[PDB]
Design a protein around this motif. Sequence first.
Motif, PDB file in Angstrom:
ATOM      1  N   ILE A  10       0.828  -1.210   0.000  1.00  0.00           N
ATOM      2  CA  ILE A  10       0.000   0.000   0.000  1.00  0.00           C
ATOM      3  C   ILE A  10       0.854   1.248   0.000  1.00  0.00           C
ATOM      4  O   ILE A  10       0.477   2.211  -0.661  1.00  0.00           O
ATOM      5  N   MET A  82     -16.822   2.531  10.757  1.00  0.00           N
ATOM      6  CA  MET A  82     -15.696   1.611  10.934  1.00  0.00           C
ATOM      7  C   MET A  82     -15.286   1.576  12.387  1.00  0.00           C
ATOM      8  O   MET A  82     -15.240   2.612  13.052  1.00  0.00           O
ATOM      9  N   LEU A  87     -10.152   0.001  11.111  1.00  0.00           N
ATOM     10  CA  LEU A  87      -9.210   1.014  10.680  1.00  0.00           C
ATOM     11  C   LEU A  87      -7.775   0.516  10.704  1.00  0.00           C
ATOM     12  O   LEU A  87      -7.007   0.865   9.813  1.00  0.00           O
ATOM     13  N   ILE A  94      -7.201  -5.697   3.500  1.00  0.00           N
ATOM     14  CA  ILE A  94      -7.800  -5.342   2.213  1.00  0.00           C
ATOM     15  C   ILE A  94      -6.870  -4.463   1.397  1.00  0.00           C
ATOM     16  O   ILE A  94      -6.744  -4.653   0.183  1.00  0.00           O
ATOM     17  N   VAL A 120      -9.836  -0.709  -3.412  1.00  0.00           N
ATOM     18  CA  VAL A 120      -8.974   0.302  -2.818  1.00  0.00           C
ATOM     19  C   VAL A 120      -9.224   1.683  -3.428  1.00  0.00           C
ATOM     20  O   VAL A 120      -8.343   2.566  -3.348  1.00  0.00           O
ATOM     21  N   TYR A 123      -8.159   5.129  -1.897  1.00  0.00           N
ATOM     22  CA  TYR A 123      -6.844   5.698  -2.139  1.00  0.00           C
ATOM     23  C   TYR A 123      -6.753   6.647  -3.306  1.00  0.00           C
ATOM     24  O   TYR A 123      -5.805   7.436  -3.374  1.00  0.00           O
ATOM     25  N   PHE A 154       0.389   6.361   9.155  1.00  0.00           N
ATOM     26  CA  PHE A 154      -0.925   6.908   9.405  1.00  0.00           C
ATOM     27  C   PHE A 154      -1.112   6.943  10.912  1.00  0.00           C
ATOM     28  O   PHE A 154      -0.399   6.265  11.664  1.00  0.00           O
TER      29      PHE A 154
END
Length: 207
Positions: A10, A82, A87, A94, A120, A123, A154
């Motif tokens: 990712i 969520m 998260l 995924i 995705v 993104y 993140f």
Amino acid sequence: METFAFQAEIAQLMSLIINTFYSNKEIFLRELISNSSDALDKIRYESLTDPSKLDSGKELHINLIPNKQDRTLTIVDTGIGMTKADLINNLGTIAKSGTKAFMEALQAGADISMIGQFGVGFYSAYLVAEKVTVITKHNDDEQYAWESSAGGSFTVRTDTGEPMGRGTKVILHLKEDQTEYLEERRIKEIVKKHSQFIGYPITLFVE
Ligand SMILES: O=C1c2ccccc2-c2c1cccc2-c1nc2cnccc2[nH]1
């Protein structure tokens, strides 16, 4: 506030989205509206078995909120929301598998606009945003804020902002050259082109 490292796949996709020359950026909005529609379908379907799942709010909607002063475009939905585990953990799984499938499809000749077929599409926000903040509330957990400016990292923290009831807000802190996505005519054009048949009311707020 807790800080987490993105896994390699990712992280590479975020760099690809940020660095690749690709003019058709508007598709981010279709992808986020489609995600909101899916989250609304999920809470609606669960409510057919357990109607108390809508005690946190009966209204099923999508709001698009531009703010020129803050340079943000916010996509709000009253979907399933969520949890913290979604998260940090579940969506990390995924993101890895969807990125691997998308990268395989791209190397073969697919277009960045097909990102949502790989799960995705969230993104695609990095086509227009330097930072993305996700505020979310699921019935089975507290309100959280997930955030990333792509550092390879993140963050996740419990959110002290206005309580949401249930759902998700995706706050796009737009890049300086992407302010067209704060204009009423531009947003209206994009929603009509890509999202005219979504099965929930989409309200385009104005200033
Ligand atoms: O809509 C989506 C979405 C859609 C598809 C994948 C991820 C996300 C996602 C979303 C919203 C908030 C956080 C994430 C998220 N991506 C991660 C990457 N590595 C670790 C944890 C992660 N968590």
